[PDB]
Design an enzyme around this catalytic site. Sequence first.
Site, mmCIF file in Angstrom:
data_model
loop_
_atom_site.group_PDB
_atom_site.id
_atom_site.type_symbol
_atom_site.label_atom_id
_atom_site.label_comp_id
_atom_site.label_asym_id
_atom_site.label_seq_id
_atom_site.Cartn_x
_atom_site.Cartn_y
_atom_site.Cartn_z
ATOM 1 N N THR A 137 -22.585 -29.530 -13.765
ATOM 2 C CA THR A 137 -21.868 -28.777 -13.969
ATOM 3 C C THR A 137 -22.425 -27.361 -13.881
ATOM 4 O O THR A 137 -23.377 -27.067 -14.360
ATOM 5 C CB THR A 137 -20.812 -28.605 -14.984
ATOM 6 N N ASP B 75 -18.688 -25.283 -9.324
ATOM 7 C CA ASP B 75 -18.768 -26.313 -8.603
ATOM 8 C C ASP B 75 -17.436 -27.237 -9.133
ATOM 9 O O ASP B 75 -16.585 -26.902 -10.115
ATOM 10 C CB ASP B 75 -19.992 -27.201 -8.800
ATOM 11 N N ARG C 135 -17.697 -31.145 -9.181
ATOM 12 C CA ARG C 135 -18.123 -32.457 -9.277
ATOM 13 C C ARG C 135 -17.766 -32.829 -10.897
ATOM 14 O O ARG C 135 -18.535 -32.376 -11.819
ATOM 15 C CB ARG C 135 -19.545 -32.792 -9.178
ATOM 16 N N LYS D 166 -12.616 -26.453 -12.625
ATOM 17 C CA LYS D 166 -13.526 -26.194 -13.546
ATOM 18 C C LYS D 166 -12.984 -24.683 -13.980
ATOM 19 O O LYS D 166 -13.685 -24.248 -14.849
ATOM 20 C CB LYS D 166 -14.887 -26.544 -13.451
ATOM 21 N N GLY E 131 -19.987 -28.572 -20.527
ATOM 22 C CA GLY E 131 -19.877 -28.996 -21.582
ATOM 23 C C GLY E 131 -18.962 -30.179 -21.475
ATOM 24 O O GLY E 131 -18.700 -30.641 -20.243
ATOM 25 N N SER F 153 -25.201 -27.471 -16.676
ATOM 26 C CA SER F 153 -26.574 -28.279 -16.290
ATOM 27 C C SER F 153 -27.128 -27.439 -15.089
ATOM 28 O O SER F 153 -28.227 -27.256 -15.071
ATOM 29 C CB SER F 153 -26.188 -29.576 -16.168
ATOM 30 N N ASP G 274 -28.699 -29.295 -8.854
ATOM 31 C CA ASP G 274 -28.407 -30.212 -10.381
ATOM 32 C C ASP G 274 -27.671 -31.368 -9.855
ATOM 33 O O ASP G 274 -26.760 -31.347 -8.710
ATOM 34 C CB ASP G 274 -27.430 -29.331 -11.062
ATOM 35 N N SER H 71 -23.855 -31.420 -10.596
ATOM 36 C CA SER H 71 -22.970 -30.242 -10.008
ATOM 37 C C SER H 71 -22.733 -30.898 -8.437
ATOM 38 O O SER H 71 -23.931 -30.910 -7.878
ATOM 39 C CB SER H 71 -23.703 -28.968 -9.945
#
Lengths: 234, 219, 206, 229, 244, 229, 271, 204
Positions: free
Chosen positions: B1, B17, B19, B33, B47, B129, B166, B169
Amino acid sequence: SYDRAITVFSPDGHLFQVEYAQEAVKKGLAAVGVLGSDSVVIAVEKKSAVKLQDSRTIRKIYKVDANIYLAFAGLSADARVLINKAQLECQRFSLNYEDTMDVDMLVRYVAGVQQKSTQSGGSRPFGVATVIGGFNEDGKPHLWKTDPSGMCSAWRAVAIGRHDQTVIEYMEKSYKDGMSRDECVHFAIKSLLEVVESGSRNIELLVLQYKEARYLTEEELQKFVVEVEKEREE
Amino acid sequence: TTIVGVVYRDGVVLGADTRATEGSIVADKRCRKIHYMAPNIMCCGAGTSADTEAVTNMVSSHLALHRLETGKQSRVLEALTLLKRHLYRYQGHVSAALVLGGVDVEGPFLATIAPHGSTDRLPFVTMGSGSIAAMAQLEAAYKDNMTCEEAKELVASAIRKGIFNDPYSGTQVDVCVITKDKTELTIGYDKPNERMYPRQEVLLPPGTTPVLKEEIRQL
Amino acid sequence: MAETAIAFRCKDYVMVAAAGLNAFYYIKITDAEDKITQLDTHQLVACTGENGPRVNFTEYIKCNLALNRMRQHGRHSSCESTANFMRNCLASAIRSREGAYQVNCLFAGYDTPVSEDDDGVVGPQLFYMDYLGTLQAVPYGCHGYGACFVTALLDRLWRPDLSQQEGLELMQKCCDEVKRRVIISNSYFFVKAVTKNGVEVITAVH
Amino acid sequence: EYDRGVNTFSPEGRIFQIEYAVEAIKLGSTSLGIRTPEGVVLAAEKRVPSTLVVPSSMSKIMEVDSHIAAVMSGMVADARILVEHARVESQNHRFTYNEPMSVESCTLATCDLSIQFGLMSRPFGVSLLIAGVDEKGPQLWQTDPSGTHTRYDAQAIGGGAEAAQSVFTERYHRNMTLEEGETLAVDILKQVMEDQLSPENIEVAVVRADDGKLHMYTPTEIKAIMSRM
Amino acid sequence: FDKYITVFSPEGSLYQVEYAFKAVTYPGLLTVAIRCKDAVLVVTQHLIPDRLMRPDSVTALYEVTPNIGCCMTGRAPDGRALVQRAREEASDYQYRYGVEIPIAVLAKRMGDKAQVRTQQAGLRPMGVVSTFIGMDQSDQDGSLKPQIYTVDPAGWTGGHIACAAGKKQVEAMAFLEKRQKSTELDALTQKEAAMIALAALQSAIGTAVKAKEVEVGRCTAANPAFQRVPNSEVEEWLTAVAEA
Amino acid sequence: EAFYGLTTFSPSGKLIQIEYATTAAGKGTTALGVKATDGVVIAAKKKAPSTLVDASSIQKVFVLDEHVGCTYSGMGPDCRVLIDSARKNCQQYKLMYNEPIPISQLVRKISAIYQEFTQSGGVRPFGCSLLVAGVDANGYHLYQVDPSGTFWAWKATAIGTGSPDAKAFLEKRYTVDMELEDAVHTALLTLKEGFDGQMTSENTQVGRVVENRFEILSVDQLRDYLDQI
Amino acid sequence: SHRYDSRTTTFSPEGRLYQVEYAVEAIQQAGTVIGVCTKDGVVLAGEKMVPHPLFDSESMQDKNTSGEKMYKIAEHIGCSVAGVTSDAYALLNYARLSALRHQYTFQEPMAIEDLCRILCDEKQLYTQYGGVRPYGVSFLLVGWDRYYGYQLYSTEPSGDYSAWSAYAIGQNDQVAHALLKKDWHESMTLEDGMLLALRVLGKTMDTAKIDLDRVEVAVMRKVPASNIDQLLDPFKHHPKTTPRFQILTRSELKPHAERADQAREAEEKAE
Amino acid sequence: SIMAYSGGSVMAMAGKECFVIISDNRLGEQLKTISTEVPKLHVVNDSIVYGLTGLRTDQQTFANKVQFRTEMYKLREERDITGKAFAAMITSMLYEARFGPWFVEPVIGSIDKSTGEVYLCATDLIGAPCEPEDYVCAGTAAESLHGMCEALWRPGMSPEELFEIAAQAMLSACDRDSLSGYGAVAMIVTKDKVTTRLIKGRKD
């Protein structure tokens, strides 16, 4: 929490709320207990038999444990609470002590709940007297009474509710020790009919013998009401 | 994320993002998100999804309520204080990490809340992340008084750095722009990942799978 | 695990067996602790685990059932009722201060018409419970170290329609397999059945 | 009657519910207690409401412990509560100090429950006498609803009490035997009771100084007392 | 039976709340508050008959927060207690939301607090009328507008352009209504306003006031903090009233 | 710390404190509501005591959530209690079910708070009625809640002072066909009936449920409706 | 504050509890409800209040869960109340939770008489502890359980309760009792009971015809079970029939009300 | 792992105005199989079905909590809960227990009865939702089920086409999971019709 003091002494030593609970028990339907050699007999007045109440058998003598049975006079709903407490106590007891509760132990528990409610702020007394009958796990039969003050007492025979003392005066005269099952049932029916009108549909009667509790069928009862109402002419 | 916010001349842009993993598997390719918090405030979270959803909902609701009490527009700093107080009390156990962005009477307001309940009001931020990768594109390109488009492009660019670098993500960039007047959320502002082989319809004709029993029920 | 209990249900009975062993570490205290507890006239529970839990759990159920039968004018609870009550009690305990009741049950019963109006299930019921409050109706089940030997033996031999006599024979093979293959001496098994006519003790099998 | 709350003082410095609880103890059956150097004696009018009552069940005398007895007057159910507490306290004392509780310590701990009212709606309408034998020899105390214990040498409580404090003043000396005490006890009851004194109508017990144990007289042994008079 | 506890009378009224309103006038002090275009003023009488009492020690004006003043009118110690509660409310609010409590919210919360005392038995309603003044930021431009919120013992909260409470609150109000038919009160200047306030106080109490017999509190857009106005400046307004 | 009940039955069976609270709740100013095929309108008089009250600051109509509104009559501050609770409940429900609370559930929640204050100890009942108007999956709604805690769905009604007459006048003019423009017109006409003096967009407030939302008309929007009556 | 305590849970001098006597007075003011317990189901017929032409429906999606007089407590339990309506809703919610807690714990329907005891315990409490007033409510409960079949209890504010074959609460309960006495018997169909319920209800509220506008009827009867989902728990037994609480629409009730006009016309011929 | 102890997998997928939800049938204690006839689906109402996975005792407990909540809902509200509310509710319940969680992982399918909009939602054990448009799934075989559903699933399938790929997916994946199997039960839910089917699978 509401904890006002409801039950309090008045000037001449009396606890009015307890005298008035007792007044509520004098308005209640009669019940009678008789102790024989090998039997306890609990008999109670029913209110009548309006064609509307459920023709399915509703008992007015309550089972508290396998061995113990309780009639009451006074406020039905108070009674129901006491009984539930008594039921639940007998199980608590089994569960703690494996043994089954002696009758006297159960009676004392109940009487203590009654007493406790004449001294707890926030609460009025239960307006309930009880007759309690049963056998210990040693074949000895017992019969007790509680009144709303929380006082219990064992009796050879007893009455509670309306005209309790008329019925008790009667029973003092007649009652003999070591009656048979059948003489007990007779004696109880006789005693109740001192205050109840017919013996038709307004008497439930329970017979307790060691390990066996059995309500009279309305048929078995009527042989006893004729056998008795025929003995009241004399 | 990877979530990202930047302040621009007129407002705040947030980005994310889409995912949603579980473990090392993409449960959802296209989750949102960027949570609504108020008419003039959005939040993105990273998180522990559950913690992020609980917390934003709770605060969103509180501010909705507070807005009826007060009659006024919610201040981004009330939003932030409710969040940090909550997260601080749970000592990090509520592992939400938020970027919070809105516009109030006092102007644009962008902030991070970390799970332990620290905040950092700043002109650009990242969490997640993908945060480091994205932060690097913000440090490289951010400037003061960006136009809305400049800001969107940069936010997308930054989120692409997480999408592509990432593992946690991916998929596409969502952005949300918040001006004084309005909040325009834009799903798939950048879709840099179609699929490159068309799906191969595997033909499984009715009755193909052996059935033992069947109960039909009409409504 | 040391004390193996077994049960299975045919058309007209459910039969339950459980090892008498009571141990203390390796010291065998008796081979004659009946661990099959009758809860009601048509309900019994074979329960395994340390005496503390096993007795407290079973005595709690037995009381609460009895209580409820008072406060319900002599009417027998259904087996599914009772099993759900047991399950909920087990389950609640795993999240309690005190902790799981470490016991495993087979709850077996036979449901008869409780009145003229009862459209309910009639017949044998058997439930597998575990200490966490898993609860599953099963045609047979076991707990303990023998559990798996027997379970595979029953998968081989059990049929839904055994006679009460074929059942004694089959239960004997079950007990015997547990003696043949478990290191722990389950030398004597108590066995009971529930039928329309209540709980019968079965001395022909051990 | 709810005009005055229950914690209220009268203009003479008495708490009203206490004075009323005391009035209730004058409606009670007479009980009495006699300290002798050979032991203590308690005796109570049973005052049963019917011949159909089983008289053992209307027990106005209660073992608190092997060496302590109590006898109530007033509201019996209230007395059951106090005696339960005494029993518990006496036993906690053995538990904790491995010795029998003194009689005074016991009476205290029974008054410690009677202070509590505002907790308890009202006072206990009960007076106890608590006879016992400990290290200081036989002892007789009285609790009141006040919560005020008072050691006595002889005492009555109940409807009798006034007529029975006449008789103690005349016939009680600090030096009587346990049999002269039994006798004076039963005499007093004969005189103040409503009913005819019979061996079931009363309850008698003694705690003997010598063994320090409490004996409840059976109806037989109470006849054996009525015999000599 | 209904006169002494917080239950309804047959007419549907709460006696103890009505009587709490009389506690407001019993002291004999009047208060007036008024807002102008960029300020709000509250003027209350400040009567020190006792030559030996220390004037600076007794006050009906209180900072609730730096940006909210209030004037309590009525039973003084009940006012002091509400102020404590206000203060607590304001401070709990700053802790929870990170911002200073808006004055209309504070008023509302103090009305909730009062209402409770009228519905739960055996709590005496505070016999005051609370008058909060302060500035208030608008969401459009961010400009500060002046506010006067009262709360009364029933919990009735209201915003006002001008307001009086206390003895002769009626003749004070009548005067301001009358002066509101002439001028528009939210287009006035802090001077013209204070003049009106002071003149209303004077009309009502039937006397000319001196500076030391009033105490004046103010918030202004320029300086939003709530401040006791110094006597020099009250003297000058009182001079400006006697003249024009 | 008072825990006894203030509302109690009286020998005829009536709960008199609740009749008095109901009396109090019909002493407010008039509020009324009109349900229509495509919305609801609620409208109240804001009769400000003086001109020196900032009428912007008086709220007689309130948002409880995006989709539901109320107004009230009787004691303002009592109603403020209900509204605060109802707002919370709307939000608790969204937090749980992530949908808007249906009006039926909201009113039952309000009803329940009212009932608690008719039985719980120490408290008097609420002296205000509410109209609640809103839109859910079952459509448009308009409910009245009284201090008994009773509530009624209505197609049109009126609480407060001029209410018998306002109800009578709504009975005539109400039609099940009604659209919302006509509903507003009718609501405002009904107020105007018993209104002492000119109606202005200052001394009246109006809420409408339209489409899927509740909104309090601005003074601008209300002035366009008050130029057509 | 203690000077103002009305001492709701005290006895009076004849062992009467005045607050409970007066709750009962409040109930005898309420809309009449009749209940008739057959062997094909139970019927509740209640007097609604007079329908002002501005009343709306709540437009609930489930027509059988509640009406004006009748409420469902569970799939197998219905009730009807007389007395302080808001008290009813407090209790009704309590009865709903209780029945569902029973089902949580045992996974079977609560029996009617236990639901009833639970309810009346909650009432008894307020007549003994707590210094507040009692619930001023009387239920008629109905339902079906495997123990006793169709049942019909009635509760009072004291917390007592009683089983009946038929009964009435509310306005002219004495009169309605006397009329059920005469016409109830042990072998009634559902249709017969619906008739008896309406004849009595129409006789107590003094109408020539039954006023469909002023009457609600609910029926508790067993119907074929539809959603036997048997692949989903294979061992679970699903009864062929299941109880259903039904509130009659105006149309479903029209026939039964006509058929009770016809047995009120054919009883004024003999005279 | 506690989430794997009892075995079991569930999966739901959307098509055009329909979904399929499907469970395997096994109930274990780790590698011991206890029963092969334990489908994990619960029907809330005509339009919602859910499955739970995870520790079986918690499946039971939580399903019972869900049935209390839903039956209560239906009485208070006089309507059926909808899948969005239903899933919100669940999520709420799981999150109440955030600090001592229910070891379950619900998988919810639902279909708005009007629209035909289909709503799936799976959650982790503390109630984080996952509301994809395609398919959701959980349990011991969840890696493999994602494998299969990715591969086989396509938009706008009809009840039948959708059933076939649900079943092939559940079986193929369960054939690679020791703790899931013994065939499967599947409910196909349209606007008009619910169809349950018991599907034959391996006996290992």
